[PDB]
């Protein structure tokens, strides 16, 4: 009746041709206009198998996001093996917009609607769509921001939970705001993120309880990342064109799982390691004024130590294909022709 198959998917967006914001500039020319009445058809009585970990939709979104970043970011200096590239580095307008992934003729996208679907296995409530939901291509580590939520319980996704090297995606069912500010005026690189600790620790506590169901009720303990690059030992993200790096030691507080505002210390860095591929880039010092991003934390990226009565987890991230997975897990492409 249909065949699993891969094809070249295109993107669609509500990008504006008059916007100087870089995602708009990219998407107006990478992606078609969104269709104003998207049809979704329930496949009555169908059970279908899915696998979020072998889904070429993720690879294609990855290529587009790299394309977007390669066009849009203007580092003063780009260092890659045998190459120092120098150019002008004016400040840009930067704020992610959603994009949708869509099939050409002959293919359709199947969507798993089982609320507690973990990403692999049979799905009992399947529909066909022309395009995904709108996904913001937000590039971050540790916390997944401005994404979709799980509809019922908190979900744990891993390619293989027993393999301590495989990243665990936690999909939250209630978001918690994180508010990051480099205030106006004066260590210009000093910033911070505020999180309501009551709301956060309640959610973290539910996360701990859910992980307990997968690890035979053992004590769940969080520890800071064990080492590596700053982009992944910190919660890193781009806020208005600036590269923020936020220390998350206090976010993952085992005593709390308090009450008050949690304040994470952040720094805006100019010399960064590039997520798109090998090498480093240098940017200009931060723009003047109040730099602020208020984001919804909708997911968490973790690794488990593995290798007694406890399991130890540490904030993860860096493989930006895990970011796309957290939103594409419910979709797969099939061939009808």
């Amino acid at each position, epitope marked *: 009746v249909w065949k699993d198959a891969d094809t*070249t998917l295109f993107c669609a967006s509500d990008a504006k041709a008059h916007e100087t914001e870089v995602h708009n500039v990219w998407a107006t*020319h990478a992606c078609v206009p969104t269709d104003p009445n998207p049809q979704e058809i329930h496949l009555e009585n169908v059970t279908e198998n899915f696998n979020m970990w072998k889904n070429n939709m993720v690879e294609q979104m990855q290529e587009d996001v790299i*394309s977007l970043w390669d066009q849009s970011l203007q580092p003063c200096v780009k260092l890659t093996g045998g190459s120092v590239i120098k150019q002008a580095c004016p400040k840009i307008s930067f704020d992610p917009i959603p994009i949708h992934y869509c099939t050409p003729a002959g293919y359709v996208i199947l969507k798993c609607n089982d609320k507690n679907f973990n990403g692999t296995g049979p799905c009992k409530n399947v529909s066909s769509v022309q395009c995904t939901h709108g996904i913001k291509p937000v590039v971050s580590t540790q916390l997944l921001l401005n994404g979709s939520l799980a509809e019922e319980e908190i979900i744990i996704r891993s390619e293989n939970l027993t393999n301590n090297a495989k990243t665990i995606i936690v999909h939250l069912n209630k978001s918690v705001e994180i508010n990051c500010t480099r205030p106006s005026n004066g260590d210009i690189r000093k910033a911070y993120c505020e999180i309501n600790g009551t709301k956060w620790n309640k959610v973290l506590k539910q996360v701990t309880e859910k992980l307990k169901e997968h690890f035979n009720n053992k004590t769940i303990i969080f520890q800071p990342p064990s080492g590596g690059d700053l982009e992944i030992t910190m919660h890193s993200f781009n806020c208005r064109g600036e590269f923020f790096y936020c220390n998350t030691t206090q976010l993952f507080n085992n005593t709390c799982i308090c009450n008050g505002t949690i304040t994470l210390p952040c720094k805006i860095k100019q010399i960064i390691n590039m997520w798109q591929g090998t090498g480093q880039a240098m940017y200009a010092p931060p723009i003047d004024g109040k730099i602020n991003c208020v984001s919804n934390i909708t997911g968490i990226l973790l690794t488990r130590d593995g290798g007694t009565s406890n399991e130890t987890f540490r904030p993860g991230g860096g493989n930006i294909k895990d970011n796309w997975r957290s939103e594409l897990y419910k979709y797969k492409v099939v061939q009808i022709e």
Partner: antibody
Amino acid sequence: EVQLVESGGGLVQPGGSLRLSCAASGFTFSTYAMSWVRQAPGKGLEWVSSINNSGRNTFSADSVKGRFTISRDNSKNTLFLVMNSLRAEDTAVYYCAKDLRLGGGSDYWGQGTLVTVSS
Amino acid sequence: SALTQPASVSGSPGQSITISCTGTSSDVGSYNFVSWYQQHPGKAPKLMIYEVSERPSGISNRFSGSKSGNTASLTISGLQAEDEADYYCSSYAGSTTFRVFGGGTKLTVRG
């Protein structure tokens, strides 16, 4: 200012092939969607194909599906149209066009290249 | 043609004339991506109006575009001799048909 110059047209037998090239200058080629639009002698405009900025995605008219392929080389500022299995009804001036947006209208058009399919 | 335009329209200098372009609810009716092009003999098309009613820089404000339902319209006020040319409408049409054009309108300026 934008310039677009088409080459590679000419005379070709029915069933034959051609490759059209468009040389782009005056703008940052790699950031724009591009299209080919044709016009048979004495007749109206017909969209043929379009390509997004990176070239990862292409779109073609049903009348040319499976015969024509659009592509681009962003390192060389060139747009191509590979055309196979040509027929008389493909005879036309083929214009290269720079697009306002993918799927949108084309704010700059080359002078076109005539393609004549005949023995 | 997928969009329908009158084959011919005429006017006198200084008159206002309007060229219709009728499509369907999956093209003109679904988006605001209608463009109009002017084509003089032997020359490439020139964009006059895009996104229904926007004008590129350097195009006379005598040219304006509008839409109602599945019908777009190009209006040319204070008609001049040099407006005598062929005019084509065009729309996005969804992700498979993509872009559709009208059959064209030959505009003549009498006097």
